[PDB]
Amino acid sequence: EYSTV
Amino acid sequence: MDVFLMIRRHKTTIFTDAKESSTVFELKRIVEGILKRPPDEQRLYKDDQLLDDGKTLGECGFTSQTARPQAPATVGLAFRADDTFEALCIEPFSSPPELP
Amino acid sequence: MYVKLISSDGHEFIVKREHALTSGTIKAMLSNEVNFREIPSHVLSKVCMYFTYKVRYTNEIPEFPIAPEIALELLMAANFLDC
Amino acid sequence: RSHSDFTVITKTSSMLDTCGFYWGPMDVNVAHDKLKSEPIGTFLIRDSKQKNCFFAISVKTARETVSIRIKFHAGKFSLDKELFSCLFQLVEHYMTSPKKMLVSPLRKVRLRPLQELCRKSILATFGRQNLDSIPLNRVLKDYLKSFPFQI
Numbered sequence: 388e389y390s391t392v
Numbered sequence: 393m394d395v396f397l398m399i400r401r402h403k404t405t406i407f408t409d410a411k412e413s414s415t416v417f418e419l420k421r422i423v424e425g426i427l428k429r430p431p432d433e434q435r436l437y438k439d440d441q442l443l444d445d446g447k448t449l450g451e452c453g454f455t456s457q458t459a460r461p462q463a464p465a466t467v468g469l470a471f472r473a474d475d476t477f478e479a480l481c482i483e484p485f486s487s488p489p490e491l492p
Numbered sequence: 493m494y495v496k497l498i499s500s501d502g503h504e505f506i507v508k509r510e511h512a513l514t515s516g517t518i519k520a521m522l523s524n525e526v527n528f529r530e531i532p533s534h535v536l537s538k539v540c541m542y543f544t545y546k547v548r549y550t551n552e553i554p555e556f557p558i559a560p561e562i563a564l565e566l567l568m569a570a571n572f573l574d575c
Numbered sequence: 576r577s578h579s580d581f582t583v584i585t586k587t588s589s590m591l592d593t594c595g596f597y598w599g600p601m602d603v604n605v606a607h608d609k610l611k612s613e614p615i616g617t618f619l620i621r622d623s624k625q626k627n628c629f630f631a632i633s634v635k636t637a638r639e640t641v642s643i644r645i646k647f648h649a650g651k652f653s654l655d656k657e658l659f660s661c662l663f664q665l666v667e668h669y670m671t672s673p674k675k676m677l678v679s680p681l682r683k684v685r686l687r688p689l690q691e692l693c694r695k696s697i698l699a700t701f702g703r704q705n706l707d708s709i710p711l712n713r714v715l716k717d718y719l720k721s722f723p724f725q726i
Contacts (some may be wrong), residue, residue, distance in 0.1 A: 389598045391655040406506040407540050426494055426506055461544035462556050485534040488561035538700055542689050553685045560700045569692035575689050
């Protein structure tokens with residue numbers, strides 16, 4: 388589970 | 393908890409630790425083994441306040457929160473010169489120079 | 493038991509022998525007294541605090557404070573004392 | 576390919592091993608489970624099991640623990656729109672900004688040597704630019720340039 392900003 | 397101290401007299405500084413529940417007299421016993429002076433020839437000070445023998449370090453204001461390993465509390469030390477105890481005298485450390 | 497460390501200005505610092513063995517340099521030149529004719533007292537006192545700081549918290553560790561005015565001289569001592 | 580991009584990645588990898596908070600090949604689950612017990616804002620750099628991703632940064636935000644991938648494109652490092660030449664220049668940037676997404680790095684050894692703590696203070700007050708205006712000899716000046724960051 389990865390994301391950004 | 394444990395309290396970390398700096399016992400200073402003239403140009404001598406002793407780094408040591410003790411229990412917050414330990415007494416000032418126990419601290420004098422530590423200095424006796426190091427500087428070869430008996431407890432009846434020693435006087436320990438917090439700033440200008442003379443510490444009582446039967447009071448614990450916590451009761452004297454030395455708490456683990458205010459005397460950390462990286463910031464040990466300063467305890468003044470004076471020895472007995474014949475009749476009386478010499479005046480408290482702690483030689484200050486040097487100061488760093490001004491920033492370039 | 494205890495060892496005595498003397499600074500350039502003649503200030504005597506008495507610390508536990510096990511604490512002084514942290515420095516590889518001090519460990520190499522010790523039998524009960526070591527003379528540091530090139531390190532001032534305000535730097536050597538800060539190093540002695542680091543010995544207690546390093547040995548106690550070697551295990552969230554509180555930050556070791558370093559004033560900017562002593563950072564240059566303290567770096568020279570740390571590089572020499574190997575710690 | 577790409578020319579001097581090889582000279583950059585090989586240089587950062589040496590700095591990745593120099594710093595303490597690089598954990599190399601690390602599972603995403605253990606990275607989030609390790610940081611869940613750490614205070615808010617504690618970040619960490621580790622390898623990424625993906626094929627198109629060199630490194631990942633795992634930070635604990637106020638809401639949850641997130642892992643963000645790091646993109647490298649034409650000699651510039653970016654997080655998953657600000658490009659940076661060095662990876663630790665990217666780390667220092669997000670550490671100094673008011674957003675405080677990153678605050679403290681979880682190092683393998685939490686207690687750093689006195690030389691590193693002094694080095695971090697030297698760079699914080701003078702800067703990597705003034706590193707040559709310092710009255711310090713070559714051995715110490717080179718040590719400051721070995722890892723010139725406030726991190």
